[PDB]
Short mmCIF file of C-alpha atoms in Angstrom, two decimals:
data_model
loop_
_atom_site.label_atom_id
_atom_site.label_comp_id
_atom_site.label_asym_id
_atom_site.label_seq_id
_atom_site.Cartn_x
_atom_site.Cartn_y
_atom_site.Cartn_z
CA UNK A 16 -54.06 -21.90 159.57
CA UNK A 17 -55.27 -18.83 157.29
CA UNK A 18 -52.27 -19.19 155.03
CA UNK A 19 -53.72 -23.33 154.48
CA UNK A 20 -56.78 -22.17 153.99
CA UNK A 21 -56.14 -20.18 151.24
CA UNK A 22 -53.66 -22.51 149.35
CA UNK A 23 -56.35 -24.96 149.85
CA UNK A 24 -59.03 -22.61 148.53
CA UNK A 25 -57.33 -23.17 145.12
CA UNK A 26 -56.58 -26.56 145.17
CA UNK A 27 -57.80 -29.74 142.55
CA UNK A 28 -59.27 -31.76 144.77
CA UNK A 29 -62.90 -30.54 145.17
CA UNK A 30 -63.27 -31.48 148.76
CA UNK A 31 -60.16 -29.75 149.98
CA UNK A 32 -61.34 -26.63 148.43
CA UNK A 33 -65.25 -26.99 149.61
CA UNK A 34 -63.65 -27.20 152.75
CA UNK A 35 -61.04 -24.46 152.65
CA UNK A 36 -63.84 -22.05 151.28
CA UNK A 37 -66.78 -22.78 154.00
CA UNK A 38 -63.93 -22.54 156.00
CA UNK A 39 -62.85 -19.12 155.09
CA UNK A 40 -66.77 -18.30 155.22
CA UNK A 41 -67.28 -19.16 159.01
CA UNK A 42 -64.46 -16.98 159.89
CA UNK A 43 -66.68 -13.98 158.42
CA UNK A 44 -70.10 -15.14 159.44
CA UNK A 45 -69.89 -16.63 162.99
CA UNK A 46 -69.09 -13.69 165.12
CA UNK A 47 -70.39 -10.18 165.03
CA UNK A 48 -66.32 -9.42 164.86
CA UNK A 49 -64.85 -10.95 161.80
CA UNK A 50 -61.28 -10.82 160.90
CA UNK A 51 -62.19 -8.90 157.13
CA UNK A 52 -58.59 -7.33 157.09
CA UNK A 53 -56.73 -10.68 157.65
CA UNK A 54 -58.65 -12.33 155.01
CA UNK A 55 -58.28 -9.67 152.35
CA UNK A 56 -54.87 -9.29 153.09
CA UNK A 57 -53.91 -13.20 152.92
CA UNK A 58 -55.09 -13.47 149.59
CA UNK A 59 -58.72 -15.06 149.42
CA UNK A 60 -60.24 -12.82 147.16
CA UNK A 61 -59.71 -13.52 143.93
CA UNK A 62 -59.75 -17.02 144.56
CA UNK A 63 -63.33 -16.18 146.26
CA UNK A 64 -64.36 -14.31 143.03
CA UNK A 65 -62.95 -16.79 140.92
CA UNK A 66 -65.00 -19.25 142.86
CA UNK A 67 -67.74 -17.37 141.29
CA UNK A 68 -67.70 -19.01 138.03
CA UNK A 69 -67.94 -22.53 139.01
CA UNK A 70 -71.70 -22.87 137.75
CA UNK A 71 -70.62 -26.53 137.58
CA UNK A 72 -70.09 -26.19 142.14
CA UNK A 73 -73.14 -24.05 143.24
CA UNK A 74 -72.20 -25.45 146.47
CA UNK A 75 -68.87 -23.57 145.99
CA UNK A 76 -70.50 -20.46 144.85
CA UNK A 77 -72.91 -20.20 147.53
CA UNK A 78 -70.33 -19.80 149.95
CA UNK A 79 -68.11 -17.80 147.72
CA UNK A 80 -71.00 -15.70 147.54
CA UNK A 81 -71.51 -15.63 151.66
CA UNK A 82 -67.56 -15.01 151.93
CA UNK A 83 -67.66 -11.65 149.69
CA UNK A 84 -71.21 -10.72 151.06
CA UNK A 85 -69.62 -10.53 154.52
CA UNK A 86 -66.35 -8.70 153.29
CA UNK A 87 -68.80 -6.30 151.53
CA UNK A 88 -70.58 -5.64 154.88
CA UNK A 89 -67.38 -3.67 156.47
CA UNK A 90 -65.90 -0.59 155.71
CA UNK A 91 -65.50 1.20 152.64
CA UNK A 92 -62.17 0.49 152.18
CA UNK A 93 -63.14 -3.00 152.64
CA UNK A 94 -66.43 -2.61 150.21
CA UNK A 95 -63.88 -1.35 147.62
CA UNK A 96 -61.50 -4.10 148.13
CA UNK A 97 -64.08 -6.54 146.93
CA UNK A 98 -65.82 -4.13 143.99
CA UNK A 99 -61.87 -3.96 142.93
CA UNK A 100 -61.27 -7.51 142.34
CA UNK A 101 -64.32 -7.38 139.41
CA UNK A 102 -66.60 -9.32 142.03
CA UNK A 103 -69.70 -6.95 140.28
CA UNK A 104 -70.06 -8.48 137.16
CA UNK A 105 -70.04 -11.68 138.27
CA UNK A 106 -73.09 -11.29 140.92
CA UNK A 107 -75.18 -9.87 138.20
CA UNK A 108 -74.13 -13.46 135.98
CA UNK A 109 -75.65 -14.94 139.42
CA UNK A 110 -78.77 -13.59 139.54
CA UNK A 111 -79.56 -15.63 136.34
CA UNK A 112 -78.54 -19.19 138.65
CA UNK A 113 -81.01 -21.90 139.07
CA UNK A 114 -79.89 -22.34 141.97
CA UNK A 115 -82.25 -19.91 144.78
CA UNK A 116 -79.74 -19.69 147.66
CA UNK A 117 -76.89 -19.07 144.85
CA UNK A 118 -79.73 -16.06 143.76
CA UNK A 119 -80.20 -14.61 147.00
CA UNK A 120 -77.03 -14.69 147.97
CA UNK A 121 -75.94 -12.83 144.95
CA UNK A 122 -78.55 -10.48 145.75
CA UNK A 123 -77.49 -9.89 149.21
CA UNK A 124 -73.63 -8.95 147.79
CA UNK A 125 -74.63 -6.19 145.53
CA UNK A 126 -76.55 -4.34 148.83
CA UNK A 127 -73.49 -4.65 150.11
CA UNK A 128 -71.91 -2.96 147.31
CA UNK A 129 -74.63 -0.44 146.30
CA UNK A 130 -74.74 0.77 150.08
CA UNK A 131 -71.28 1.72 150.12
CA UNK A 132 -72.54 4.91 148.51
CA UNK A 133 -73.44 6.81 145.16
CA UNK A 134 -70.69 5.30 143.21
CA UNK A 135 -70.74 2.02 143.92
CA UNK A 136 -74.63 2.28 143.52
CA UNK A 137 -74.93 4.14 140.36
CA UNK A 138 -71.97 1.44 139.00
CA UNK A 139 -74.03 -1.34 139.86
CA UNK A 140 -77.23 0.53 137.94
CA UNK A 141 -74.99 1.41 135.16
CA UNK A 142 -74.46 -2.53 134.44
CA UNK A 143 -78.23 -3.86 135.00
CA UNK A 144 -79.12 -4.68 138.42
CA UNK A 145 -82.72 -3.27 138.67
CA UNK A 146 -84.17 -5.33 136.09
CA UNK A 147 -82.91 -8.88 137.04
CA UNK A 148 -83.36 -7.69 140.69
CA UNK A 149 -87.33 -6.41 140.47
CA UNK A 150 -88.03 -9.48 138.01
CA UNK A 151 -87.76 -11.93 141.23
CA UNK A 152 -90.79 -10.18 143.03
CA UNK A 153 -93.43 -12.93 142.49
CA UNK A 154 -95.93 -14.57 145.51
CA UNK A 155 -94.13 -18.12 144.79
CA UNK A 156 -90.72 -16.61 145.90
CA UNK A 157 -90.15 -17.01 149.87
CA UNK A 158 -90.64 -14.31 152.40
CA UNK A 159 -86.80 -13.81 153.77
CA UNK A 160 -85.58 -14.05 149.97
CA UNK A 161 -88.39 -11.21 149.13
CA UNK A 162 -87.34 -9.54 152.12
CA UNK A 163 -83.26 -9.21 150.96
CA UNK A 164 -84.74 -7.73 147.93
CA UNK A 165 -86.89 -4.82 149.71
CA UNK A 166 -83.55 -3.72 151.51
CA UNK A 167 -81.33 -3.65 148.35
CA UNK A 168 -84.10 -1.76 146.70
CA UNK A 169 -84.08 0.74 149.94
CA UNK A 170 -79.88 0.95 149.59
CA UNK A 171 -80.68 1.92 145.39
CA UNK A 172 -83.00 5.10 147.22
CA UNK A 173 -80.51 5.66 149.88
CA UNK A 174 -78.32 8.68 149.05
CA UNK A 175 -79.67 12.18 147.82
CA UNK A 176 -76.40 13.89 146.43
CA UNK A 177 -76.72 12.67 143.60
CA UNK A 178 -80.25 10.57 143.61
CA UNK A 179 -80.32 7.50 141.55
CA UNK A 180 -80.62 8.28 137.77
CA UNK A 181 -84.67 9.38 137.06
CA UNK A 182 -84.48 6.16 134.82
CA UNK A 183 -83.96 4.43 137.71
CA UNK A 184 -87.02 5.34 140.15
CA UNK A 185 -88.98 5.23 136.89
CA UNK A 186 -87.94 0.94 137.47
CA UNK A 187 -88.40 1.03 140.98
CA UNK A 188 -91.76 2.80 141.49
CA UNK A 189 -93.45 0.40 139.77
CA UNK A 190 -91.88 -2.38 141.85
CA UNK A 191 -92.73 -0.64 144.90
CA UNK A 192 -96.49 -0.26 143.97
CA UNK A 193 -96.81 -3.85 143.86
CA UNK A 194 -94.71 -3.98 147.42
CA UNK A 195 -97.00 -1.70 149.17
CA UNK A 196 -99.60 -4.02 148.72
CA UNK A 197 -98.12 -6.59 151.52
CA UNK A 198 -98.94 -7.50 154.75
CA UNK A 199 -95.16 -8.30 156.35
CA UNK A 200 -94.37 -5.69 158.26
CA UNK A 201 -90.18 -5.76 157.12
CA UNK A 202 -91.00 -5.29 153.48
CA UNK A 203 -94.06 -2.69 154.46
CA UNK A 204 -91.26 -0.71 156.30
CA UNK A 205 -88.78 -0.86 153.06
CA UNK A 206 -91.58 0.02 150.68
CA UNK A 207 -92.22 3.24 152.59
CA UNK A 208 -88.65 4.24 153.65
CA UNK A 209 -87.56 3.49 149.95
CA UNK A 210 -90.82 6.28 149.16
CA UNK A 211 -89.50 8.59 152.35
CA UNK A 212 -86.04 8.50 150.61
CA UNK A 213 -87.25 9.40 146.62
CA UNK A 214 -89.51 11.86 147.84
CA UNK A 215 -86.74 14.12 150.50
CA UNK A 216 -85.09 15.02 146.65
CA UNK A 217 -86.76 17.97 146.04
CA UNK A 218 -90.20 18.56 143.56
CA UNK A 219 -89.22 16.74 140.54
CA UNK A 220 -88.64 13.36 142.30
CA UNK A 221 -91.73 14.01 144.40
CA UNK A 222 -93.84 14.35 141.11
CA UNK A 223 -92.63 11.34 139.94
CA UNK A 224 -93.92 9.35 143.19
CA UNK A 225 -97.19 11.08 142.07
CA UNK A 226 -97.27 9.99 138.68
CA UNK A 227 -96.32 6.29 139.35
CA UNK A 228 -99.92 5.92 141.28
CA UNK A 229 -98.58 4.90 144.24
CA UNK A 230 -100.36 7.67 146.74
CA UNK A 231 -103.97 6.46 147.53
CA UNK A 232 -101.48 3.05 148.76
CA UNK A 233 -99.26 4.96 150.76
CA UNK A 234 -102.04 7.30 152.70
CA UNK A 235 -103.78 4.58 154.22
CA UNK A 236 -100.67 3.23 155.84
CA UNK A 237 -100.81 6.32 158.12
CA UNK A 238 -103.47 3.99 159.96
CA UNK A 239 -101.47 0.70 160.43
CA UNK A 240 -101.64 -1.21 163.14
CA UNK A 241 -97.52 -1.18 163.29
CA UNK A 242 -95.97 2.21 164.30
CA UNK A 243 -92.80 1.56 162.25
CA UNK A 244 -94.74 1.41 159.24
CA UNK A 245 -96.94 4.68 160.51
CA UNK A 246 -93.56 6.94 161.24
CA UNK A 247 -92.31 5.86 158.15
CA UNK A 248 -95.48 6.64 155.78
CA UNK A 249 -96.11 9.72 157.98
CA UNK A 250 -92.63 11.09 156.94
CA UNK A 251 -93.18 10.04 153.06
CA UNK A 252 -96.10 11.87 152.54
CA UNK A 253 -94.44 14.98 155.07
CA UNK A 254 -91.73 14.99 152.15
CA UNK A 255 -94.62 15.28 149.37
CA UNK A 256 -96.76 18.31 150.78
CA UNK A 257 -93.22 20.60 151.29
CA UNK A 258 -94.16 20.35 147.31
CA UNK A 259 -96.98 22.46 145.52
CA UNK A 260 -100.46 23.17 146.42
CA UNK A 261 -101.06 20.73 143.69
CA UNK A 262 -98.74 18.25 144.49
CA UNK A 263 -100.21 18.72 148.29
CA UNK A 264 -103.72 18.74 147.18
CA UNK A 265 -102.85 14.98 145.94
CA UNK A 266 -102.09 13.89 149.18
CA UNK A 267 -105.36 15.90 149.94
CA UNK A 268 -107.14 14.29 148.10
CA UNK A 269 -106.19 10.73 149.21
CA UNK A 270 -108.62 11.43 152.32
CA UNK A 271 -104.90 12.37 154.23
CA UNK A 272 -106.58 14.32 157.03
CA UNK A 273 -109.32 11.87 158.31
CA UNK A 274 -105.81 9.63 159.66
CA UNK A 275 -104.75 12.84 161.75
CA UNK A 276 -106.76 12.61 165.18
CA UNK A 277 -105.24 9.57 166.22
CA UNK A 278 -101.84 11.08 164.71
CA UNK A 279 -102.27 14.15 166.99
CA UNK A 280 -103.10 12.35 169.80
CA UNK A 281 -100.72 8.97 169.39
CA UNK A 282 -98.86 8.17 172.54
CA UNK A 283 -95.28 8.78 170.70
CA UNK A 284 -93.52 12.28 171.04
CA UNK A 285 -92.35 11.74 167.33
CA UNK A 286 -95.53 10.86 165.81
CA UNK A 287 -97.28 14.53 167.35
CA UNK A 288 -94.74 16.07 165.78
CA UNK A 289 -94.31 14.65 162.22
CA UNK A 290 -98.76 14.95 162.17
CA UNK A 291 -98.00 18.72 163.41
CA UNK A 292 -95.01 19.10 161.02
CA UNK A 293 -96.67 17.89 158.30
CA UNK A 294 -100.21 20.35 158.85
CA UNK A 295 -97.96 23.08 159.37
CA UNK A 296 -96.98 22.31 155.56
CA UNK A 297 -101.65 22.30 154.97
CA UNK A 298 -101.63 25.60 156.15
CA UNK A 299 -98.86 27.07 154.40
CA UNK A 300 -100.89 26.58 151.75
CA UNK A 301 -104.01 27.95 149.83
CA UNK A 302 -107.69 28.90 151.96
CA UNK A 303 -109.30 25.61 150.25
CA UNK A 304 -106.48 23.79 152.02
CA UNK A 305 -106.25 25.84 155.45
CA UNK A 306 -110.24 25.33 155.16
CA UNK A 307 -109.98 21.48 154.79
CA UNK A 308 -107.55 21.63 158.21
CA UNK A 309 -110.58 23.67 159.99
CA UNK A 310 -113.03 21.17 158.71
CA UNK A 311 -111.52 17.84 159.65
CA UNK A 312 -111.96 19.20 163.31
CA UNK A 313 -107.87 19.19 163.74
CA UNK A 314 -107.21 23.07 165.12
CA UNK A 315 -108.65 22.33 168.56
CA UNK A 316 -106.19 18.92 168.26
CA UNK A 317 -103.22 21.21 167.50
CA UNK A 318 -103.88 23.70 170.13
CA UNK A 319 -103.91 20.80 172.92
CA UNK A 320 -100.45 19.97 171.15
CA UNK A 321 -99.21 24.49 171.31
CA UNK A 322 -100.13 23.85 175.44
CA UNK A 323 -99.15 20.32 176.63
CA UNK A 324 -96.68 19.15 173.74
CA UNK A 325 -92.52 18.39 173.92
CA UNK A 326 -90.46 21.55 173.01
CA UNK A 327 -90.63 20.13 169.45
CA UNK A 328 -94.27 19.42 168.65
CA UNK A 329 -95.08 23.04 170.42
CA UNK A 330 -92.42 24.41 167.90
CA UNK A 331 -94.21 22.41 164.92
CA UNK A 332 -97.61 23.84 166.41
CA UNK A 333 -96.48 27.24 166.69
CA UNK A 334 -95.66 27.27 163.31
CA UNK A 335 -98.85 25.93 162.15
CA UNK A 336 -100.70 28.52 164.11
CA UNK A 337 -98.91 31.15 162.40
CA UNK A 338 -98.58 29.67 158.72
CA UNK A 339 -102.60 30.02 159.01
CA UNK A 340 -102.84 33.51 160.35
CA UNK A 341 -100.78 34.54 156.65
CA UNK A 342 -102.86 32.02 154.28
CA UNK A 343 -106.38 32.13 155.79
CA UNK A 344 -109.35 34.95 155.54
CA UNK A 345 -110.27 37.03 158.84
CA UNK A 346 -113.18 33.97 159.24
CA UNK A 347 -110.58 31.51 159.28
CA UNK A 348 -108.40 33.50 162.30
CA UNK A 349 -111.66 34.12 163.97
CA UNK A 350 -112.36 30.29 164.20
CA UNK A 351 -108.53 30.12 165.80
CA UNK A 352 -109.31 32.88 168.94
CA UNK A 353 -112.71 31.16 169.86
CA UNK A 354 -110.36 27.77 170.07
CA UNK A 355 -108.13 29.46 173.16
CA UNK A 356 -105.24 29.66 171.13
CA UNK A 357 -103.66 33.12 172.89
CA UNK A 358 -102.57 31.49 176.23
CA UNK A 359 -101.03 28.20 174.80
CA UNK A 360 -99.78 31.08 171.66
CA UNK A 361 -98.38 33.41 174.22
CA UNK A 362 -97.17 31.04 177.21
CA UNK A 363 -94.26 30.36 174.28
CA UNK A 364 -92.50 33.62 174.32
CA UNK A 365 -90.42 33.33 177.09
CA UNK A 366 -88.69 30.29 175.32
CA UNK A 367 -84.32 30.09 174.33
CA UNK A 368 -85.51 29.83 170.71
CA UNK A 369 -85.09 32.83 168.72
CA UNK A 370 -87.11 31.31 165.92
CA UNK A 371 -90.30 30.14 167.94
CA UNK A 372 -90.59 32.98 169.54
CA UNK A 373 -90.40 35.00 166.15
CA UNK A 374 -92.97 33.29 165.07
CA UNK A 375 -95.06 33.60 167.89
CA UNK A 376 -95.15 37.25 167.85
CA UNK A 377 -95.63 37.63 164.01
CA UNK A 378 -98.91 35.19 164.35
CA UNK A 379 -99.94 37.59 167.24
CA UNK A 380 -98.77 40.85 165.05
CA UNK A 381 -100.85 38.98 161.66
CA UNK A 382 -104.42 38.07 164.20
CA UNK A 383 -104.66 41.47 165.54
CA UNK A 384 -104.39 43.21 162.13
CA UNK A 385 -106.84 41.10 160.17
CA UNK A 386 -109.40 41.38 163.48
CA UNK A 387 -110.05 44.88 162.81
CA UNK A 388 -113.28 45.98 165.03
CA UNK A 389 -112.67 43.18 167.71
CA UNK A 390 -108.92 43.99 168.11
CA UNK A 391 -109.48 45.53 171.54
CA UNK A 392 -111.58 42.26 172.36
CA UNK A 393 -108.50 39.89 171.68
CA UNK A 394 -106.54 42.17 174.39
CA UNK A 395 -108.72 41.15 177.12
CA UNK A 396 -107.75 37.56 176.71
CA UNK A 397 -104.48 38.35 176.20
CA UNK A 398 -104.67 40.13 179.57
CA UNK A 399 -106.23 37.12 181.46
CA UNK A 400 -103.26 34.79 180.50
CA UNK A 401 -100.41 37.55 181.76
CA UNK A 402 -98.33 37.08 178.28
CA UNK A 403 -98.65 40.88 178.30
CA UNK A 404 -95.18 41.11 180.57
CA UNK A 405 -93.73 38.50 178.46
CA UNK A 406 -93.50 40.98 175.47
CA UNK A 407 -91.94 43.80 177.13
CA UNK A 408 -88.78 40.99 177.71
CA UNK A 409 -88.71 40.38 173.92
CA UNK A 410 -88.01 44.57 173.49
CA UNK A 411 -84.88 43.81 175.51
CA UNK A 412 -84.33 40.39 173.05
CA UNK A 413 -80.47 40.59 171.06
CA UNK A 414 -82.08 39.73 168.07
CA UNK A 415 -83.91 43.16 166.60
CA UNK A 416 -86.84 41.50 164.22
CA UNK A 417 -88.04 40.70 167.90
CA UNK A 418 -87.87 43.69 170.09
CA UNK A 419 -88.95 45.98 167.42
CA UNK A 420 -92.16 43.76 167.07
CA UNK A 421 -92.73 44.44 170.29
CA UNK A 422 -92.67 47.89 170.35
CA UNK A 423 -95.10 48.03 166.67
CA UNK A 424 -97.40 45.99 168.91
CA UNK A 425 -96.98 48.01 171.81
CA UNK A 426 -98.39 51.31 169.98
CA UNK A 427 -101.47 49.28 168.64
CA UNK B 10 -77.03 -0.07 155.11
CA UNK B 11 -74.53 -2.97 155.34
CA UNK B 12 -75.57 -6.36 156.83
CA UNK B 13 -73.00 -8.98 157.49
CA UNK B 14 -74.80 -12.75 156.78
CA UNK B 15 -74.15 -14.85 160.52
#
């Protein structure tokens, strides 16, 4: 049956080979378990490929098109069997069809192929996909078409080792300005994973999304009504402020921190601790900054978060705590102790984690230092919540950055 | 990553 299918793929007679190639097509598109090897093996591809050419058929390339789209979908090994047979070029000739569905289709191939990884990607670049790809976003284009073009521009962001060529994003940024601008919710969530993606490549990348304009867009998305769209901008502009106090004080100074209460307090586990993750990265930084955390009324909101939080947003908290006892003035700290930060900041060091506890104690060791005449003072409430016996324990800790901070705390 | 057409 497969081995008439395929002579019939190539024959004369143009309804034998309609039929033998939508026939070879619904093998690969009407399960969710294809037979890809069988197909490849019995010799369809070229004939698929060739199928490609057939301007005069667009009938016949359509489902060529579907046939190698689907093939493209599997494994690598299957990916490469298509990519191998010189099926690229010949999708990029289709994006110029007048036909849409022959367009889209075409489209739909190469994400295929350029989310099989870095090489297959930066192949597909090298020969001019962005261009023809970005130059069918237009309103009069239809939603699911626009849509297949959002997730191929994603799978051109995808990988990190290497990134796309900075040519590339300097194409795509643009693009994705105009994107961020919609109100579907798919291409929303492409537009800011494509930005979560460019910007987790380190501080040249991240100045780029910078310079492209695209920030004061992507900011106000941390208040959609969609969560998808919220974890997904949340984590885009967590990737920009692990950048400089400059390149933070962008974000800054997109209004950021007035979207943080209901961050802070969102009913997700995930959300509390991307909002805490990301002000931990606030208060790393300069006073202005750490100052600009106090004054959005958010300290008191991440001290809820130290007590009643998930392991992971009172690690995140913890952190944020103590990145502000190093950056800020002794004004700053004294803001934190009249907040009842010591029981939910102690009530952590009997915890598995090395690290959290670590920084626990340093953010206790930092306070007590930089209150100078009201040292004794902090001692009292430090009494009250019993974490007192909990840092004798850390002198018997493995780890020795730990015990011996116990012990230089013990003697003051 | 990879989406089959159905």
């Amino acid at each position: 049956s497969l081995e008439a299918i395929v002579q019939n793929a190539s024959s004369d007679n143009q309804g034998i080979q309609l039929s033998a190639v939508q026939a070879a097509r619904k093998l690969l598109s009407s399960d969710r378990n294809p037979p890809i090897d069988d197909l490849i093996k019995s010799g369809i591809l070229p004939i698929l490929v060739h199928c490609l050419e057939r301007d005069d058929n667009p009938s016949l390339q359509f489902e060529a098109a579907w046939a190698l789209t689907n093939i493209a979908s599997g494994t690598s090994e299957q990916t490469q069997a298509v990519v191998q047979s010189n099926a690229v070029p010949l999708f990029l000739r289709l994006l110029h069809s007048p036909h849409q569905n022959v367009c889209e289709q075409a489209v739909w191939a190469l994400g295929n192929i350029i989310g099989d990884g870095p090489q297959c990607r930066d192949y597909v670049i090298s020969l001019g996909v962005v261009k023809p790809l970005l130059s069918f976003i237009s309103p009069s284009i239809p939603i699911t078409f626009l849509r297949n073009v959002t997730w191929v521009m994603v799978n051109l962001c995808r990988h990190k080792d290497p990134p796309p060529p900075m040519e590339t994003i300097q194409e795509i940024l643009p693009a994705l300005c105009v994107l961020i601008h919609h109100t579907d919710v798919n291409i929303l969530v492409d537009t800011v994973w494509a930005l979560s993606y460019l910007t987790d490549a380190g501080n040249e990348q991240i100045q780029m999304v910078i310079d492209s304009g695209i920030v004061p867009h992507l900011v106000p998305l941390l208040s959609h009504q969609e969560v998808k769209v919220q974890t997904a901008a949340l984590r885009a502009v967590g990737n920009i402020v692990t950048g400089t106090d400059e390149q933070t004080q962008v974000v800054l100074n997109c209004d950021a921190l007035s979207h943080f209460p209901a961050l802070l307090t969102h009913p997700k586990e995930k959300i509390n601790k991307e909002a805490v993750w990301f002000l931990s990265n606030i208060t790393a930084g300069n006073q202005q900054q750490v100052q600009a955390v106090i004054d959005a009324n958010l300290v008191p909101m991440i001290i809820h978060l130290l007590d009643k939080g998930d392991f992971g947003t009172q690690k995140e908290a913890a952190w944020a705590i103590s990145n502000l006892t190093i950056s800020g003035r002794k004004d700053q700290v004294a803001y934190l102790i009249q907040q009842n930060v010591i029981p939910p900041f102690c009530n952590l060091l009997t915890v598995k984690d090395a690290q959290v506890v670590q920084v626990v104690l340093d953010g206790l060791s930092n306070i007590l230092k930089m209150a100078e005449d009201e040292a004794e003072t902090i001692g009292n409430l430090i009494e009250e919540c019993g974490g007192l016996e909990k840092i004798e324990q850390l002198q018997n800790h493995e780890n020795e950055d730990i015990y011996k901070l116990a012990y230089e705390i013990i003697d003051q | 990553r990879k989406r089959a057409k159905v």
